[PDB]
Amino acid sequence: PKSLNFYVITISTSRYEKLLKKEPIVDESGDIIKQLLIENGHKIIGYSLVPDDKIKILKAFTDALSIDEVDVIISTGGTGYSPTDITVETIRKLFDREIEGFSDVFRLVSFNDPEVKAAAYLTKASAGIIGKKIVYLLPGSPDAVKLALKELILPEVGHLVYLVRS
Amino acid sequence: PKSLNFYVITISTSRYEKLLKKEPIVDESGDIIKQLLIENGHKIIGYSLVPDDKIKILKAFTDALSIDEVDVIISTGGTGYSPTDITVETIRKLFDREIEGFSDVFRLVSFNDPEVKAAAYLTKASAGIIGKKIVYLLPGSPDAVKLALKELILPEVGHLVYLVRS
Amino acid sequence: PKSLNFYVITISTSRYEKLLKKEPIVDESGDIIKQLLIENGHKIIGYSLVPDDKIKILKAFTDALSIDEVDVIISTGGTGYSPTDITVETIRKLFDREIEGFSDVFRLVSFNDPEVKAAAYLTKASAGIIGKKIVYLLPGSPDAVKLALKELILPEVGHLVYLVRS
Amino acid sequence: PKSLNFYVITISTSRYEKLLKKEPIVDESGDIIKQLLIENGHKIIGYSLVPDDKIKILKAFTDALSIDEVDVIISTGGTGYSPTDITVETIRKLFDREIEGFSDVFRLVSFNDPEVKAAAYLTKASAGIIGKKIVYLLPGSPDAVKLALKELILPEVGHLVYLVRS
Amino acid sequence: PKSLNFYVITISTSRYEKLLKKEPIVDESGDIIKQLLIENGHKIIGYSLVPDDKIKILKAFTDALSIDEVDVIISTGGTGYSPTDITVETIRKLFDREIEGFSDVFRLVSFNDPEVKAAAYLTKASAGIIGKKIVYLLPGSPDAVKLALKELILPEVGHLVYLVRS
Amino acid sequence: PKSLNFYVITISTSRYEKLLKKEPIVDESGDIIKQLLIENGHKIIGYSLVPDDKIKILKAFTDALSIDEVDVIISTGGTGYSPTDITVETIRKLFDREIEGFSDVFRLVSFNDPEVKAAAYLTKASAGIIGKKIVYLLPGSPDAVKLALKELILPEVGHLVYLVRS
Ligand SMILES: [Mg+2]
Ligand SMILES: [Mg+2]
Ligand SMILES: [Mg+2]
Ligand SMILES: [Mg+2]
């Protein structure tokens, strides 16, 4: 299988505000995505951290989309029903095609986690295609991100990139 | 855990026609919802019964939304593919935010019931948020309503109400 | 249980091009659909083969819809994320009502097939209602079509036809 | 021509807050609508005053829609681009059918007013049909309301009610 | 200037029913369209007559779209607010791209006709593009069809066909 | 009246291709916008030139939206029915609120020009609000841009900016 190039975006107001104050931050979810993607033979070619702000989130995504070498963009954060969760409403609109089934299949595997169960209906984690690039909008939770990567992204992303570019 | 205030809406033309004549009605599904809610420490602060009529359905929901003390509205009926089933089409247009995953997660738990299985794809049961209130639109079937309450609403609704109001 | 009348549409550019040249084609998925329907007491009252072309797909479907005796239309092909897959985007527009849950329940059954698993989120197989006729848009894959027929269509299609004509 | 029955809704936060404090209010726009509708042989069968609040606006409309004798509902207020203008976004969704051309034709006649001109593109005044009733969502401005009534509503509303009920 | 090939579709339930009975019909609007097109150097390469039935309307349009030589499809009938008027709702779905401004510019020219004026907001006449073919959905009214042809279609249709095939 | 800060975006593949080679460019439409704005006391705080490419268009707009000091963004190009015109389809998906009437009011003033007339229905020029900023998407034609600026933007934009920020 090909090594693919990934850009990672963390959407977290608390962490962004610390970055502004030059304070130490731990980005557990972003770290997990990088670690797993690298462990599996892929490359991280960029990373950004933004708060729950429409314009800032759009700029983070367009910056990544504008790098020709990027194959896949993965974000973590802002896909639930907190009043300030706006990631899906901001980005999903931009997809050339929504990968419609990613949302329900992610909720299916989430429902199977005995620590999640019915909480599965409280995520809007989504995937789509823009140009020849794939985009995954994942939850803030480290366990959720790990689940999405291992069960859904790592096994199929190669074939999906191939397919979209065929 | 917090006692929450619920408003129950039964959508049934046959039962509504009896109501108009003050003839006896058995509302099995509405009664199941009320009983399960009370057994779990919640309160029923309102109830209404309407037929499959767009205006009457809209009024039933707006009358409930107008009560400041209501936290959650649950309806039963009119969420399938009978020509006269219009509940979801009517009330989705009120949502501030659709709780998108409720539909497929409800169909997942329904499919898993060996008495239901593939019949799961014949429901459009849905949920959403209007203001600081949660709305669940459930099937007419007593067994479907019991499943939704026990497996999906009772376990998650407290945290969901908190989240939407945070 | 009614014998129902089915019209079968294969959407395959490679096979269509062979047709034009008057060469042998082998349509495994269409053949599977026909055999499983007949074996279950249903009738095949028409069949057509078209490429991934919008107008030709629309014509195939409207020709079938224009036959009063047709109860159900089932197509195979063009429901994935290949750049040329346009079946769902083309026909889903024509639905009076989308049978919304067919998509996710199909992906649920697909995901539980140990040979498919995560590949489940790469399909957009869908169903809908036009007039008093039911329409299923299935994948090109022979295994997917068998799964859809055995698990979802054959068990519920009788009741669904009844229901929409109620 | 028939005498038709109208329900008038004023959407104004300032006026609503005075009503709560039992203070005198002047509703110039509502008064103009009543006066002109009555001068032209029609009847006013109800009136309500609400602020720019989604739930309160929905309740005002459903209350009017639920009166069988009502033929037409006319509202004034909240159809522009103030952050708090939400009338169109709240009600337009509820239409069975939008009367699509009302919006642009109203902007056409507004553009012709030498005191409005290009300000015409800053209104979203709209019309639609719910059940057998017509709904007009008009601006807050008295001159705008007068214009809508004289040029668009009074001349055509009779035929439109007839048509919708045919 | 190209001679273009036009297909003409009349949507009229009363005239269709006469056809079935083999009685004389008189189609004034279709006749106007044909005469004005021919008089302007264009060709009529097909014609059909259908009632206000979704499937029959879809079949009329797809039959025309399936003729390679057809450049433009023009229909007359079913674009108002009669409960049986379904032309726009049916065909507008099929557009690759809606020619968005045809609707309001048609209503502008209509409004300026001193015999139409405010009746202008009661039409939904529309235009769109499917493949490399242009489609105009015009009212049933003979005067409306003449106006559309003379003021909007004949002057711009050549350039529009050129443009979409660019 | 307030001096406002504008960001001008030219969308032209031919000019962008020249830019890449640092070949001379004449951008008549962009220059007209800049000149009229400056003559009316406004400031140009940014400019970019992009081709008809979805990602590049999205980046141009997000780079402008990211400048706190920008009040209004005006683009020229790609708002017609050429197959490669994608400006409106791309940027409408960014709007918080579409300024719905800008489209038809622009077509009204365009139709009124005797050099344009029915050509008015071949544009999709649009406007919207993102955050506290206004966005106008104008045609490529120099005469169209001049008309939009003088008749629709310069007279109303000051009050509109105030309103959106109130
Ligand atoms: Mg665990
Ligand atoms: Mg059981
Ligand atoms: Mg005046
Ligand atoms: Mg001039």
In summary, what is this structure?
Six copies of one chain form a homohexamer. With 166 residues, chain A is α/β, with parallel strands linked by helices.
Provide an overview of this structure:
Six copies of one chain form a homohexamer. Chain A has a six-stranded mixed β-sheet, sandwiched between helices. Chain A has about 170 residues and is an alpha/beta fold. Chain A is built from six helices and six strands. Chain A has a single domain, classed as MoaB/Mog-like domain (Molybdenum Cofactor Biosythetic Enzyme, Chain A, 3-Layer(aba) Sandwich), CATH 3.40.980. Chain A has helices at about 15-20, 30-40, 55-65, 85-90, 100-110, 140-165, and strands spanning about 5-10, 45-50, 70-75, 95-100, 125-130, 135-140. Chain A starts with a strand and ends with a helix. Helix content of chain A is about 45%, strand content about 20%. In chain A, about 50% of the residues are buried. At the A-B interface, α5 of A face α5 and α6 of B. One magnesium ion (MG) binds near residues 113, 115 and 143 of chain D.
